[PDB]
Amino acid sequence: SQNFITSKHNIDKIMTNIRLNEHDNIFEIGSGKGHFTLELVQRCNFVTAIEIDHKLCKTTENKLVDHDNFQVLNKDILQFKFPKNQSYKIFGNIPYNISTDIIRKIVFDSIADEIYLIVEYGFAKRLLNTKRSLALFLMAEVDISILSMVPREYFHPKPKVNSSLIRLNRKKSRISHKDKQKYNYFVMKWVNKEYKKIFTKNQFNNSLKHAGIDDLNNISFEQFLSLFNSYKLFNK
Ligand SMILES: Nc1ncnc2c1ncn2[C@@H]1O[C@H](C[C@@H](N)CC[C@H](N)C(=O)O)[C@@H](O)[C@H]1O
């Protein structure tokens, strides 16, 4: 059930959009046959490949024979403990079934200042959709941008849908550690339209007009923050 991108011609097309340089240390999520890995090692300063499947760790190693700036840890990305005092970036052509868990792991339990992932086209659209809780929790920590479309033919087994190469850039968190829970509760209550649990009937009108929200079915992350902030004001 794991797919791969093994056409160099295609890999180069995708590297074209990935701006990683010679001095960055990179953590790749799932080396697979080592195709993207082979390019990263040449492209970057050092690559720590994290592959769960042990046979693939081997293949990754055979692939990277004429190279030294890498290591292949046979671990589970979800259980990995990233450095807490180093500057590193992340890349990964990750599986659909655990996209949410991986992205959450690397954005909340890692300090990579720049993350490059390939995910399903739809799932990418969702990461930017202010109507879903994931996008909202994520936008407090990173800026999300879709760089290009990865045709399903580039993959094998050929999936039923296309994919997108996306980029997550770290930013000074917009949500203080103090507001950790308030923001969480508020995000969940708002996405579920359970407005009354977070705003009285008037607090809600003022908050929307204050944030300048005309279409309540289409709001910017910046507007949403306004809402959250008003929310804080109203409750001590
Ligand atoms: N939980 C996990 N932790 C670490 N690696 C995983 C996990 N789940 C899947 N993988 C690996 O991640 C890879 C997913 C592939 N789509 C990418 C392989 C390869 N980089 C390629 O795109 O050509 C496979 O090699 C899986 O074995």
Curated annotation (Swiss-Prot):
Superkingdom of this protein's organism: Bacteria
Transmembrane found in the keyword field: no
Q: Which reaction does it catalyse?
A: adenosine(2085) in 23S rRNA + 2 S-adenosyl-L-methionine = N(6)-dimethyladenosine(2085) in 23S rRNA + 2 S-adenosyl-L-homocysteine + 2 H(+)
List the InterPro entries hit by this protein, alphabetically: KsgA/Erm, rRNA_Ade_diMease-like_C, rRNA_Ade_Mease_Trfase_CS, rRNA_Ade_methylase_Trfase_N, SAM-dependent_MTases_sf
Outline what the protein does: This protein produces a dimethylation of the adenine residue at position 2085 in 23S rRNA, resulting in reduced affinity between ribosomes and macrolide-lincosamide-streptogramin B antibiotics.
Concerning NCBIfam families, the annotation shows: Erm23S_rRNA_broad, erm_C_23S_MT
Recorded family membership: Belongs to the class I-like SAM-binding methyltransferase superfamily. rRNA adenine N(6)-methyltransferase family.
Protein name per UniProt: rRNA adenine N-6-methyltransferase
Gene behind this protein:
ermC'
